[PDB]
Symmetry: D3
Subunit: 133 residues, 6 copies
């Protein structure tokens, strides 16, 4: 049993895909244990969330996008939730994400990619602490 942190990104709101994305996770039998709606996430939480990318060329654009609309932060619980939801999510690169995955079916950009999911036990604990202190 694990908990993982998911963000529904602003593009999902723009494209009316919030329920589509949450529903794929729900259908896999993962349970919501915490959830918050952000009309606009604070810049600082975004920058901490993506702190590992702070020196990357895309950092400012990434942060700007992430505050360009609402987000939902969700903690999901289930056996091996971290790796399983990562598999549902699909590759960051739209040249690679597989049909059947969230990004494979729905995302068409490396940045506007609909969903964040924690990538490891340690990052899940960190991200949960950021969004649900």
């Amino acid at each position: 049993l694990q908990r993982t942190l998911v963000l529904i990104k602003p593009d999902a709101f723009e494209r009316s895909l919030v329920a589509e994305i949450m529903g794929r996770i729900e259908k896999k039998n993962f349970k919501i244990v915490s959830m918050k709606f952000w009309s606009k996430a604070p810049r600082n939480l975004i920058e901490q969330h993506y702190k590992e990318h702070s020196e990357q060329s895309y950092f400012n654009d990434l942060c700007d996008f992430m505050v360009s609309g609402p987000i939902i932060s969700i903690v999901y619980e289930g056996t091996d939730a971290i790796s399983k939801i990562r598999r549902l999510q699909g590759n960051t690169n739209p040249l690679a994400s597989a049909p059947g995955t969230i990004r494979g079916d729905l995302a068409n950009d490396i940045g506007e990619n609909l969903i964040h999911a924690s990538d490891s036990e340690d990052s899940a604990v960190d991200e949960i602490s950021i969004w649900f202190p």
Copy 2:
């Protein structure tokens, strides 16, 4: 432009219908203004929400059901959102709710009926204040 209060009820969680219900409202182009997840809503909140039903025979059973699992409280915004979301919701009674509505397609019980939606401007203001006192 109106705001209405929606509750996703514990049966929606039990039956894995949360996204199905939220998706129906989303597809109609209503926007989420506020949203809160409750692992278990306090009974007092439920009693306030349903204060008008306090003398009904089902009142205690209703409150028990509403604290039996999680709830999501959502404020939706849109033109005439109150009446429109009520029409999407469907009638309380499973003998009446129309196919095409949330309850008509998905609910089979008068109590376990998946979704609350404010029924008037007055009650919306009241219910939003209960679930989102801030």
Copy 3:
């Protein structure tokens, strides 16, 4: 609590709509009590099922259609299942069946109308005995 008899008709098989129809009933929380698949139902069974239509002009065409492909006979159980599944089914006439109903969304003919559902407690008992004599 009631039991009703449903037939998935040969047009549902031809149009690959079997799961679509069954899924609508499943999503409403009705439970399967008995189910039988018929590669081709015996004409006598069809004539008994529709005995009340024996003097109608369409009777032979109706029987021909019903043996033209497979049928699934299902007994569903639930509170007020008979009237509820009738409302999900929709009116026989394509000029009347409502969007949101099975026939309203999917059927375009008065005869090739995808689904049978018992219309009363009396007929349910009768039809269940025809399809599930055991």
Copy 4:
């Protein structure tokens, strides 16, 4: 057997609902006879299509909206296709369109209402001649 003229309106493209709408008609077993994609329909065509509305206050806004993005014009064929597709379409007014209909499920505005469908045999002939003069 009838033919009716359907327009998929620019809001359907903006909201990525083209296939959703076309799919509802397809699932009802109507057949496409002719179809044209317009990156932007000429304003004159729109004015002719809606000539009966020329004195209405919304006429210019309606024409502006109709040229604001792509349109697909489709001729559908089927028994009583005109009235049937009108029932699937749903009422113009978001306070009235029924859950289960295209507009009832998906449209939230009196103007941005996703779909046109001919309302009579006379208007179908007229509209088909506008969009498919050949």
Copy 5:
């Protein structure tokens, strides 16, 4: 042209996924040629069905689960039905089943995995004989 034996497992009934599963197979153009509903399958048919697993640690739990609710046994027919429906089914292990497969999208447990499908020509003939003697 082949026939294969599918079981819709009790978890599909519990989670109201019977039509979802049958529909994926139907949409692939496979045809039902036989079908039976079991309110509760006889223990002995289950034990014969899974006879190869009789000495495995999970055997008793597997059999208990399989009689814990209804099942549907279905014979499907189509060109290369056996391998094709196996591909639709997805890996037994939820760490491996691919998004887009039945188990990949819907199952979250190695045991409660929604669907059985014959794995070979010989096992299909055997399983069909068990469920449709």
Copy 6:
């Protein structure tokens, strides 16, 4: 940004899958820039479209199938549309097409395979010129 040529094949019309197929592409955020409905495509356009296959054993059957019902020709536009829509399409061979792809989920024959999509920049330009001269 690229344009690619898609054909919705006659089997999609027969099986009422036109919107299902177009919808998968629409949900991936590709935009229609040209589209024509053919009640019956001219034999010569089909033979030119598939000119590379003219000496293959299946050529006549392929062409006969392609004129056996309506088709829709569509030009889709988007970043890397050619490879992305090819990935959505899935392998020609039903023993290989992956669940989650159009063919993987819906097609059950090597010939009756629902959809054509250009396989390269050069073939896209050629096919667009055939269907939209």
